[PDB]
């Protein structure tokens, strides 16, 4: 039924949700795939064509949501060749009834006849719309007797069916009969063939599977299912003006309606068996090929750092070698400015390994990799290592506050003589698989020196450990979690809780002194002519 508009034709269609442009077409074009069309939501454009007749025998309605030259819903011009003697001679618009918005323009079609005969005011609604029909067809045949002067062609079957519809007062202006019994529904654009939503020729707003409706089936509804906002399973999306259950062609559902691609601040997600645009949140996913192995870069240096801006996945590994940090005079790569390392604060996943053998001495924490959540380890370093932290004598805390999974590989943390807080760390939580002979943690600042100088996990960190001092560096919280901060209370009584996480409660959850304020967050959890 539906088809986005502009040689063959995927136009065995009835409505073109767009413009119909016919340009630079020769005489030998199968324009028969258009016969079925009977609504054009944009304009119709016919220019630079050599074919003799334009078959659109079923077209009745041209909406003109978009108009050509800001004036015309139909535009027909220069459809002739002088050398060839091929030219347009007829517009087969026998059945054309209503041009909702826009005018008509037919000029400079040397062999096109009879366009001057018809009455355009019977069709165009906007009477202030411009209508130009000139300089297209002299030495033209006169019209048939049966047509009585109004025709889309020489024959007697090519007459404009100009049948006056004197609708009744009660009828708001569109009717399928003469008396007040036969008023078209209010949602009908033009007339109708009956008094229902289904009987309209064209819809004033939206078409839901034949029924002309004011709004496509909305996403949330007070369906009384809970007497509140519910997911009417019967939900539909706008393909411009036709309600569809599933966006056809190759579209995506951005909120209420179909679109050709998600907007800038959103991304595609596989949801409800459909592709939906969900808001990007922090930042849209951006993968960026990594270093080492199949990469052309053996380390990150002053040439690669700016290639990792706004990256969420690394699609590979990350290497921080002293040749990249301090520069390379045999390659003439300059040294790296430590601030640029902040580029990695957006990284949440690394497909292969992470290798750190050098780091700016002032940086006492790899907190630039705080939001790292997963190290895949599908590519590995040295003797099968997914995480390697070596020879860092100015670092004092790991700082991987958001690391939760190392999908595969071995772990090596050795010779970071000033590093603490890693002793108490349940790696069995983070590393996937048996931690058997897979940990190589040696020669960091000994436990005793760390505890003596005060370097220990915050009391609210659970036995899982921590990635540094403070409550925000814990692996797991002993009691409850106020965001990234392990928190000791939860404000439940004197703020609800779920899965040992402290959250705020929905509006209208009456604050109650000494008792539960929320029992959960929501309209259904909080503890129109109303009272």
């Amino acid at each position: 039924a539906v088809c986005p508009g502009t040689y063959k034709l995927y136009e065995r269609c009835e409505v073109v949700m767009g413009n119909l442009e016919i340009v630079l077409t020769g005489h030998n074009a199968d324009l028969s795939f258009l016969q079925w069309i009977r609504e054009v939501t944009g304009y119709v454009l016919v220019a630079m064509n050599e074919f003799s007749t334009l078959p659109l025998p079923n077209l009745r309605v041209v909406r003109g949501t978009q108009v050509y030259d800001g004036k015309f819903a139909i535009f027909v011009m220069l459809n002739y060749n002088t050398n060839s003697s091929h030219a347009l001679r007829q517009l087969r618009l026998t059945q054309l009834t209503e041009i909702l918005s826009g005018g008509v323009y037919i000029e400079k079609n040397d062999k096109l006849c009879h366009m001057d005969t018809i009455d355009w005011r019977d069709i165009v609604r906007d009477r202030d719309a411009e209508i130009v029909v000139k300089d297209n067809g002299r030495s033209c045949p006169p019209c048939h007797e049966v047509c009585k002067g109004r025709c889309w062609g020489p024959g007697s079957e090519d007459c404009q069916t100009l049948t006056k519809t004197i609708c009744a007062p009660q009828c708001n202006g569109h009717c399928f009969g003469p008396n007040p019994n036969q008023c078209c529904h209010d949602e009908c654009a033009g007339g109708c063939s009956g008094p229902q939503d289904t009987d309209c020729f064209a819809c004033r707003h939206f078409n839901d599977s034949g029924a002309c409706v004011p709004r496509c089936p909305q996403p949330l509804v007070y369906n009384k299912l809970t007497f509140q906002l519910e997911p009417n399973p019967h939900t539909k999306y706008q393909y411009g003006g036709v309600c569809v259950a599933s966006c056809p062609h190759n579209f995506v559902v951005d909120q209420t309606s179909c679109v050709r691609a998600c907007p800038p601040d959103k991304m595609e997600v596989d949801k409800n068996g459909l592709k939906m645009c969900e808001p990007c949140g922090g930042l849209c996913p951006k993968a960026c090929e990594g270093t080492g192995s199949g990469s052309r870069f053996q380390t990150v240096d002053s040439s690669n750092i700016d290639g990792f801006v706004n990256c969420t996945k690394i699609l590979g590994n990350l290497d921080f070698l002293i040749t990249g940090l301090n520069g390379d005079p045999w390659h003439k790569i300059p040294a790296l400015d430590p601030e640029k390392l902040n580029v990695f604060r957006t990284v949440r996943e690394i497909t292969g390994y992470l290798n750190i053998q050098s780091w700016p001495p002032h940086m006492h924490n790899f907190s630039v990799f705080s939001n790292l959540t997963t190290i895949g380890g599908r590519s590995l370093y040295n003797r099968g290592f997914s995480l390697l932290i070596m020879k860092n004598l100015n670092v004092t805390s790991l700082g991987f506050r958001s690391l939760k999974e190392i999908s595969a590989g071995r772990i090596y943390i050795s010779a970071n003589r000033q590093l603490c807080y890693h002793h108490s760390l349940n790696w069995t939580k983070v590393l996937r698989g048996p931690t058997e002979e897979r940990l190589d943690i040696k020669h960091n600042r000994p436990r005793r020196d760390c505890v003596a100088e005060g370097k220990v996990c915050d009391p609210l960190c659970s036995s899982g450990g921590c990635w540094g001092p403070g409550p925000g560096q814990c692996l797991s919280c002993r009691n409850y979690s106020r965001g990234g901060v392990c928190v000791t209370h939860c404000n439940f009584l004197n703020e609800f809780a779920h899965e040992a996480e402290c959250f705020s409660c929905h509006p209208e959850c009456q604050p109650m002194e000494g008792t539960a304020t929320c029992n959960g967050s929501g309209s259904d959890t909080c503890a129109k002519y109303p009272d």
Epitope: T165, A168, Q170, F176, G177, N181, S193
Partner: antibody, heavy 120, light 113 residues
Framework: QVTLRESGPALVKPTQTLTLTCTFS??????????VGWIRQPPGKALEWLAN???????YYSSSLKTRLTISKDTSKNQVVLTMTNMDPVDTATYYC????????????WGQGTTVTVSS | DIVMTQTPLSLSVTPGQPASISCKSS???????????LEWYLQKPGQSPQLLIY???NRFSGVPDRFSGSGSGTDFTLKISRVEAEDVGVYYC?????????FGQGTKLEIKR
Amino acid sequence: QVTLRESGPALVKPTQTLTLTCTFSGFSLSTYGMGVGWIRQPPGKALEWLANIWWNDDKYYSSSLKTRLTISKDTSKNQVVLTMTNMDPVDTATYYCVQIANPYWYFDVWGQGTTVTVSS
Amino acid sequence: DIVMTQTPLSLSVTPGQPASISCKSSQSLLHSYGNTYLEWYLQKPGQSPQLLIYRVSNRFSGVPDRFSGSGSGTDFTLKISRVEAEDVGVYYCFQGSHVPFTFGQGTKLEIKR
């Protein structure tokens, strides 16, 4: 059961004014979509649509007889009245009143028809 | 305004044989696209006319299957497949599309015993 009855004088002198009354039951001319019509048939000749009145008080008439016809309604009495002026022997006919309920058809329920003869 | 003309002015059919009656109009009975209010009525001897077909081709509630209606514009046709003894009477065509509603002159269908 929709039933309609036509009543009126069986004899009318020329140039006088005939007044017919269609009384009906089984429906009301106050419901949206209802109309009552008047159709006459001269004896042995063809039907001729005369007039139609609707729940809107909207009135439509035959053109040739527009000046002489006048149709009226009273839902409280379930009655429709027709008035024809300047009665000529040609107007001698059987006058039927009819119901129009559906917008897809006309003249579904007919009365038996009252016979009006114009003569001095 | 609209002149209606029924073509078989008289008709005599043996029971079981078909029948055809035609209504030609002076102007097209098209009010709006897909809206042609041509109706066929039957008046049996000494009765009120019954509606047989509305909108050219739609049998009214109760009309038996043998009554059919075709047509468009100014030309329409009623067809009785198997004329029965009950079908005798006068058939009228009627237009409801234009201001002066008009009937056909009538078509007397007789029975050929």
